[PDB]
Amino acid sequence: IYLPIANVARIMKNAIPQTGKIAKDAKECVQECVSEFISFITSEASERCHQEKRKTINGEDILFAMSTLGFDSYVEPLKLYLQKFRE
Amino acid sequence: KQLHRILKRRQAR
Amino acid sequence: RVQELPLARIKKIMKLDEDVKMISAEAPVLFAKAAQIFITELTLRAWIHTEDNKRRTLQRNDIAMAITKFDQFDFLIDIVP
């Protein structure tokens, strides 16, 4: 249900100054938030697919849901990541 | 931009 | 590396959705990179409150303050007590 805490903590630590510290419950909080982020975006994409009578959540559905919900800035880096992923 | 999806997530329950 | 995040766990979260039937191969891949972007931005915004309180330890209340202040985090409002 949650991404591994070690991975979440590593991303968090990379974001802040090298001398900063992160409390255990702050890492757990972000763990919860990023599952909610996935669920929130997925809900937008899934209702759209249901309205269009489509059975598969595609990558375009996820990207479009992100654009609709205020995460349009993610679209370009995600496309580059996925394209280098499948290259 | 998020309000209606937030609501709908509450509504689905 | 972002590729290290487990796709099976991302797919499991996605499958909790009541209207999800089938998921494309690329959807969890996109969410892995999105998770990195989201964690980084949320952490940086919470860290504003850490430093504003003259602290060097990021605390859960710093994340809650960032959630309440920023529109991109509106969807997290029910996580805040």
PDB file of N, CA and C in Angstrom, chain A residues 3 8 10 15 17 20 24-25 35 43 46 51 53 62 71 76-77 79 82-83 87:
ATOM      1  N   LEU A   3       4.924   3.009  -0.778  1.00  0.00           N
ATOM      2  CA  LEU A   3       6.267   2.874  -1.316  1.00  0.00           C
ATOM      3  C   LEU A   3       7.246   2.632  -0.167  1.00  0.00           C
ATOM      4  N   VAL A   8      11.493   6.548  -0.041  1.00  0.00           N
ATOM      5  CA  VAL A   8      10.887   7.844   0.245  1.00  0.00           C
ATOM      6  C   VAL A   8      11.880   8.726   0.986  1.00  0.00           C
ATOM      7  N   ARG A  10      15.172   8.574   1.006  1.00  0.00           N
ATOM      8  CA  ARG A  10      16.293   8.990   0.164  1.00  0.00           C
ATOM      9  C   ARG A  10      15.923  10.183  -0.710  1.00  0.00           C
ATOM     10  N   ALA A  15      16.403  16.279  -1.215  1.00  0.00           N
ATOM     11  CA  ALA A  15      15.761  17.563  -1.466  1.00  0.00           C
ATOM     12  C   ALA A  15      16.260  18.663  -0.535  1.00  0.00           C
ATOM     13  N   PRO A  17      18.967  20.473   2.611  1.00  0.00           N
ATOM     14  CA  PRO A  17      20.416  20.600   2.807  1.00  0.00           C
ATOM     15  C   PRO A  17      21.020  19.369   3.468  1.00  0.00           C
ATOM     16  N   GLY A  20      20.574  18.891   7.126  1.00  0.00           N
ATOM     17  CA  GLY A  20      19.239  18.786   7.664  1.00  0.00           C
ATOM     18  C   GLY A  20      18.888  17.362   8.047  1.00  0.00           C
ATOM     19  N   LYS A  24      11.263  10.633  11.876  1.00  0.00           N
ATOM     20  CA  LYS A  24      10.692   9.378  11.397  1.00  0.00           C
ATOM     21  C   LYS A  24       9.234   9.548  10.994  1.00  0.00           C
ATOM     22  N   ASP A  25       8.458  10.272  11.803  1.00  0.00           N
ATOM     23  CA  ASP A  25       7.049  10.454  11.484  1.00  0.00           C
ATOM     24  C   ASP A  25       6.834  11.392  10.304  1.00  0.00           C
ATOM     25  N   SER A  35       1.091   7.819  -1.577  1.00  0.00           N
ATOM     26  CA  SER A  35       0.049   6.869  -1.948  1.00  0.00           C
ATOM     27  C   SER A  35      -1.250   7.600  -2.258  1.00  0.00           C
ATOM     28  N   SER A  43      -7.901   8.126  -9.641  1.00  0.00           N
ATOM     29  CA  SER A  43      -9.352   8.310  -9.605  1.00  0.00           C
ATOM     30  C   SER A  43      -9.838   9.186 -10.756  1.00  0.00           C
ATOM     31  N   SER A  46      -9.446   7.103 -13.927  1.00  0.00           N
ATOM     32  CA  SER A  46     -10.363   5.964 -13.973  1.00  0.00           C
ATOM     33  C   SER A  46     -11.792   6.399 -14.282  1.00  0.00           C
ATOM     34  N   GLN A  51     -16.173   6.789 -18.294  1.00  0.00           N
ATOM     35  CA  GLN A  51     -17.066   7.588 -19.129  1.00  0.00           C
ATOM     36  C   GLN A  51     -16.884   7.266 -20.607  1.00  0.00           C
ATOM     37  N   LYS A  53     -15.946   4.377 -21.762  1.00  0.00           N
ATOM     38  CA  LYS A  53     -16.193   2.945 -21.953  1.00  0.00           C
ATOM     39  C   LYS A  53     -14.931   2.203 -22.378  1.00  0.00           C
ATOM     40  N   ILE A  62      -3.145   8.927 -17.420  1.00  0.00           N
ATOM     41  CA  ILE A  62      -2.473   9.411 -16.217  1.00  0.00           C
ATOM     42  C   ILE A  62      -1.930  10.820 -16.439  1.00  0.00           C
ATOM     43  N   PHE A  71      -1.056  19.482 -12.055  1.00  0.00           N
ATOM     44  CA  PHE A  71       0.285  18.926 -12.170  1.00  0.00           C
ATOM     45  C   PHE A  71       0.773  18.931 -13.614  1.00  0.00           C
ATOM     46  N   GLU A  76       5.863  16.989 -19.139  1.00  0.00           N
ATOM     47  CA  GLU A  76       7.088  16.920 -19.933  1.00  0.00           C
ATOM     48  C   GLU A  76       8.170  16.046 -19.304  1.00  0.00           C
ATOM     49  N   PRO A  77       8.535  16.200 -18.022  1.00  0.00           N
ATOM     50  CA  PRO A  77       9.527  15.273 -17.451  1.00  0.00           C
ATOM     51  C   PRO A  77       9.077  13.824 -17.445  1.00  0.00           C
ATOM     52  N   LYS A  79       7.130  12.317 -19.718  1.00  0.00           N
ATOM     53  CA  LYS A  79       7.274  11.808 -21.078  1.00  0.00           C
ATOM     54  C   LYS A  79       8.729  11.487 -21.394  1.00  0.00           C
ATOM     55  N   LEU A  82       9.669   8.276 -19.464  1.00  0.00           N
ATOM     56  CA  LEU A  82       9.093   7.079 -20.068  1.00  0.00           C
ATOM     57  C   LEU A  82       9.751   6.761 -21.405  1.00  0.00           C
ATOM     58  N   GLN A  83      10.100   7.791 -22.182  1.00  0.00           N
ATOM     59  CA  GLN A  83      10.717   7.540 -23.481  1.00  0.00           C
ATOM     60  C   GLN A  83      12.125   6.975 -23.326  1.00  0.00           C
ATOM     61  N   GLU A  87      13.349   3.167 -24.412  1.00  0.00           N
ATOM     62  CA  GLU A  87      14.381   3.190 -25.446  1.00  0.00           C
ATOM     63  C   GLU A  87      15.274   1.959 -25.343  1.00  0.00           C
TER      64      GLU A  87
END
